[PDB]
A paper describes a structure:
Cry78Aa is a novel protein identified from the Bt C9F1 strain that effectively kills rice planthoppers, with median lethal concentration (LC50) values against Laodelphax striatellus and Nilaparvata lugens of 6.89 and 15.78 μg ml−1, respectively. Here, we report the crystal structure of Cry78Aa, which consists of two domains: a C-terminal β-pore forming domain belonging to the aerolysin family and an N-terminal trefoil domain resembling the S-type ricin B lectin. We also found that Cry78Aa binds carbohydrates such as galactose derivatives and is essential for insecticidal activity against Laodelphax striatellus. Bioassays showed that the NTD or CTD of Cry78Aa alone has no toxicity against planthopper nymphs, indicating that its insecticidal activity is dependent on the cooperation of both domains.
We also resolved the structure of Cry78Aa155-359, which resembles the solitary pore-forming domain, and found that it has an identical conformation with Cry78Aa13-359. After growing and optimizing the selenomethionine derivative crystal of Cry78Aa155-359, its structure was determined by the SAD method and refined to 2.4 Å resolution with Rwork and Rfree values of 0.198 and 0.249, respectively. Cry78Aa155-359 packed as a dimer in the crystal, and its two protomers were almost superimposed on each other. Structural alignment of Cry78Aa13-359 (Mol A) and Cry78Aa155-359 (Mol B) revealed nearly identical conformations, with a root-mean-square deviation (RMSD) of 0.566 Å over 175 Cα atoms. The structure of Cry78Aa155-359 represents the conformation of the CTD in the absence of the NTD and has a domain organization similar to that in Cry78Aa13-359. According to the structure of BinA/B, which has significant structural similarity with Cry78Aa, the CTD of Cry78Aa can be further divided into the sheet domain, TM domain and sandwich domain. Structural comparison of Cry78Aa13-359 and Cry78Aa155-359 indicated that the β-pore-forming domain in the presence or absence of the NTD was nearly superimposed, suggesting that the absence of the NTD of Cry78Aa did not result in a dramatic conformational change in the CTD pore-forming domain. Similar results were observed when testing the effects of the pore-forming domain Cry78Aa155-359 on the survival of the nymphs: nearly all the nymphs in the assay remained alive under the same conditions. Cry78Aa155-359 had an apparent MW of 23.7 kDa, which was in accordance with its monomeric state of Cry78Aa155-359 (23.7 kDa). However, Cry78Aa155-359 has several characteristic features of aerolysin-type pore-forming toxins. Sequence analysis showed that 20.5% of Cry78Aa155-359 consisted of either serine (7.8%) or threonine (12.7%).
Author numbering:
A (entry chain B): -3 to 191
B (entry chain A): 7 to 194
Write the structure that this text describes.
């Protein structure tokens, strides 16, 4: 039988458990949250030609994984500040792969850009993945930047921030990966934990 | 292999990426290789060492035909993504320093001399890991005639391999933005 990805529920970001010193997990367990079936004419397959797609993979699966990445964690002394690295967006290789395999890319607004034949299925695919159609005219980059936090209180405070990470990948009808996982770090979706 | 060029046609579209070639590899012991589908016994019996493999390929940074004296701005990428930095540390205990040398973490520091020698890479002296950055770069046609210009970047990719050749990682892409070749279409 044609396989079906197991859909999961993304749990809430890790939190503090009555401890100031508890190290919080760096990543949380990846959970398949969505997928969407696409015709073979949209999936340029590096090891499959037109003919064998038609008889062996007339459809492909576009899968969405989600998990929480720990952006940073730190204890701060009364009223102390500090800086940390924070990464947003999707890598350059990952955007070239997505555009070359399924004719898609991520725009500067975290939406999706649909190119070629892929444009006919935009409404289906944005719905089934629960992502939105981009209105941007430039592609998202990956950017690692510095972010400062100042402890506002006059007591010691642990603080950890988590970001929502997406991973996307395409798959033959029988389930064989034809790609690596394309990573998109959504910095508009962070959870902050203090104790 | 040589970077693509114009020969005698101004309008030629040049390749987006050359075909990747394997240029180096270094042998590493099973113990610094986190293999997700092998236990310690299977590694020792079936892949007592792994191959860290270095690949190279030219990537067209940009191509453009400019009218007389025309300028333009284009994208350009340096470095290595956070995911790729994170995978390399989880698999082989290494990452890329800010000076494009390799940082050896954990057991890997034992063999830094062997790996950098075998891979033809350098050991980083940096205290900071390389990131990935996309920035704009400007170019202006110096001539009062039409000019086609293409710039190529030499990209490095690294991946790990069981003794028998089985791929156990994605490709880790490193773009050193100072290793470039710049071709112009009327050369003289």
């Amino acid at each position: 039988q044609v396989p079906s990805p197991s859909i999961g529920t993304l749990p809430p970001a890790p939190d503090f458990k009555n401890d100031i010193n508890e190290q919080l997990p760096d990543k949380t367990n990846p959970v398949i949250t969505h997928f969407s079936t696409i015709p073979y004419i949209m999936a340029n397959d590096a090891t499959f030609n037109s003919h064998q797609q038609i008889q062996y993979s007339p459809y492909y699966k576009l899968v969405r994984i989600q998990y929480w990445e720990k952006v940073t964690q730190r204890i701060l002394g009364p009223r102390d500040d500090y800086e940390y690295n924070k990464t947003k967006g999707i890598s350059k290789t990952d955007q070239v792969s997505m555009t070359e395999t399924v004719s898609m890319s991520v725009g500067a607004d975290f939406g999706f850009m649909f190119k070629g034949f892929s444009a006919s299925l935009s409404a289906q695919i944005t719905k089934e993945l629960s992502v939105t159609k981009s209105t941007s005219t430039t592609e998202m980059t990956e950017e690692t930047y510095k972010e400062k936090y100042t402890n506002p209180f006059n007591y010691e405070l642990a603080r950890a921030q988590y970001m929502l990470v997406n991973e996307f990948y395409v798959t033959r009808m029988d389930g064989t990966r034809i790609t690596a996982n394309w990573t998109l770090r959504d910095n508009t979706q962070t959870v902050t934990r203090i104790f």
